[PDB]
Design a protein around this ligand. Structure first.
Ligand SMILES: C[S@@H](CCCN)C[C@H]1O[C@@H](n2cnc3c(N)ncnc32)[C@H](O)[C@@H]1O
Ligand SMILES: C[S@@H](CCCN)C[C@H]1O[C@@H](n2cnc3c(N)ncnc32)[C@H](O)[C@@H]1O
Ligand SMILES: Cc1ccc(COc2cccc3nc(N)nc(N)c23)cc1
Lengths: 276, 273
């Protein structure tokens, strides 16, 4: 029950407010509250999607997190043929993955079928990937999906979502050269959580884990990062194995390139122990 | 009990912080100055705004002060005399003073009430103001540079809320000017203009360095790093901070972050080529 002309508010002791031009969807789903609106056309954001009160997608900045997740992982892999995306119901990470000609197939599993339906309706430049015949899009819980996946199925697993048994399944379903990249977390709000997850994922049996920081302006404090995790040892994910500049789509990307890839693993000194 | 930030140039958008206690709120001869204690449940601590725009918080002031102070002084072969225009809070100056090469720093800020309030409410920032190697002037930086001799400064840092020709003129041959330089998300066209304008004034190279500033609108800002002498690749450090004894005291800046900060998203990269 957002109203056109009203203001959408996101909140300890800080709030962000964006004026609403047209409400497109606002209702609880089976799993979470989903809000989609056209923002004030006098500002840059365009259409906005929020999940339980928190902006997840906007027209203006959607490309950052999708390009970074899709390319930092696939450009770290020698031949990414088969890819899994867990979450990603909006289609953005999938759109990026499908740019890569080496990809033969990509499975995507998101628990909330209404997010994909609403992204098809109101974010066609993000969600058009979901109709690709190289993609199999499924509605289900990713926890159960990886539990039921055979050993050695995927070259790359991306976890684009909003436990010890889960990560051991991710490690087991990846092939020997496997690369995983995981949910965004903030060096400003979540530093302790990042340092724990990084230790835990190495302990689980990944050979290396490096955090890649990116400039997402609509995420709280304006950055987020992903842990890029290599199953095999001797792999340096911080310098691209397969530079995107050698691929025919590089000029179409709005954020990512090789210079940003190498830059993203440089952290502010207070966080640098995450990576060394 | 909320401070609300919203600027006419970015319509239908706002950021707000809960106010625990108001410390100061008055116009000044030049601008509106607001200082408050923010919610103790949150990280920001004490907050200073000027004309309704947050300029400093206890929590993240290190980022903008380290980037400005160290990107510029680490890009200079031997920075002995430094000018700061603005910076009445003391933060750039505190960073500039870490450097053993610096013999003297002049700091010229138009607003004396800023410095006064900063000594009162931000002592861990404004202690620098009392340093024997600094001279602090209340006054317009536009007038100050006009009345400064050619070839006076190694580094000019413009930390603010004909002029550039004067900055170019007062810098020695190998001089570096660094200026606060706007958001790639909300003012990218202003950065393009400024970059071209400074280059045509006669700086030989101008490069934009991006940094993560969590209390700034959309979480980032950058500075334009400008060299009078050509061939000067500012984007790699000439005096790496790691060879200096205060390197581990820093909370944000090091040489990996220096190099990284000049890598721009593809949509903004035409600022640097
Ligand atoms: C919209 S997407 C985040 C925006 C960046 N593209 C986050 C999705 O993760 C899904 N999600 C959350 N938990 C799960 C599980 N357990 N399984 C699959 N998908 C999940 C949720 O439905 C969102 O659509
Ligand atoms: C607070 S500082 C903000 C950045 C975080 N250190 C911005 C300062 O610039 C001063 N300022 C503004 N205009 C001028 C001029 N024209 N000259 C000098 N100082 C100036 C102003 O009073 C602020 O303290
Ligand atoms: C003073 C000022 C702050 C931010 C901005 C632009 O930014 C935003 C605006 C509104 C809502 C936002 N909500 C989220 N999540 N993120 C943002 N960056 C948001 C402009 C001006």
């Amino acid at each position: 029950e957002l109203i056109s002309g009203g203001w959408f508010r996101e909140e300890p002791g800080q709030a962000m407010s964006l004026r609403v031009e047209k409400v497109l969807y606002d209702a609880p789903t089976k799993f979470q509250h989903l809000t989609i609106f056209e923002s004030d056309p006098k500002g840059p954001w365009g259409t906005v999607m929020a999940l339980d009160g928190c902006i997840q997608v906007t027209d203006y900045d959607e490309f950052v997190y999708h390009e970074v997740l899709g390319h930092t992982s696939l450009c770290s892999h020698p031949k990414p043929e088969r890819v899994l995306i867990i979450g990603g119901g909006d289609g953005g990470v999938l759109r990026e993955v499908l740019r890569h000609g080496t990809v033969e197939h990509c499975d995507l599993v998101d628990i909330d079928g209404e997010v994909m339906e609403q992204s098809k309706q109101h974010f066609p430049q993000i969600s058009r990937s979901l109709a690709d015949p190289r993609a199999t899009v499924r509605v289900g819980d990713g926890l159960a999906f990886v539990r039921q996946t055979p050993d050695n199925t995927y070259d790359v697993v991306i976890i684009d979502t909003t436990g010890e048994a889960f990560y051991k399944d991710v490690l087991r379903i990846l092939k020997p050269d496997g690369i995983c990249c995981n949910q965004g977390e903030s060096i400003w709000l979540d530093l302790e959580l990042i340092e724990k997850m990084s230790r835990f994922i190495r302990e689980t049996g990944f050979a290396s884990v490096q955090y890649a920081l990116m400039h997402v302006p609509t995420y709280p404090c304006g950055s987020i990062g992903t842990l890029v995790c290599s199953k095999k040892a001797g792999v340096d994910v911080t310098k691209p194995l397969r530079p995107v500049e050698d691929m025919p789509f590089a000029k179409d990307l709005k954020y990512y390139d090789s210079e940003m890839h190498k830059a993203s693993f440089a952290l502010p000194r207070f966080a640098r122990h995450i990576n060394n």
